Design a binder for this molecule. Sequence first.
Ligand SMILES: [Zn+2]
Ligand SMILES: [Zn+2]
Length: 132
Amino acid sequence: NDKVYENVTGLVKAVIEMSSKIQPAPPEEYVPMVKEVGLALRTLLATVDETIPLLPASTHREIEMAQKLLNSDLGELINKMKLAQQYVMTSLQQEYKKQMLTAAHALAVDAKNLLDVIDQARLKMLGQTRPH
Ligand SMILES: [Zn+2]
Ligand SMILES: [Zn+2]
């Protein structure tokens, strides 16, 4: 029932689709795939921003560093995609596509880590309630 959980799943599902599709694909197919991953990231980041005011102050910094890491993971993917599109129909085609896949996989791992960090913050938050 949890929007952070749903947003992470969507982002991972987008990365898994691109991953399963990128090898036999021209730019016209893989630009939209990167764009779907991007928007799912943007969605997750907005959800997390809206969640932070609920979580303990001591957890804020580590969540925020996990957010910045995903943002820099998306920049890396975009970089490698632009490079894969430049060396289209060459012998650096596959190389750059393999680096896209690596960057996407990193993005998925980092989304899962961010879920882990928020999940522990939520457990910590149960520990600091108040009687009435
Ligand atoms: Zn804060
Ligand atoms: Zn991988």
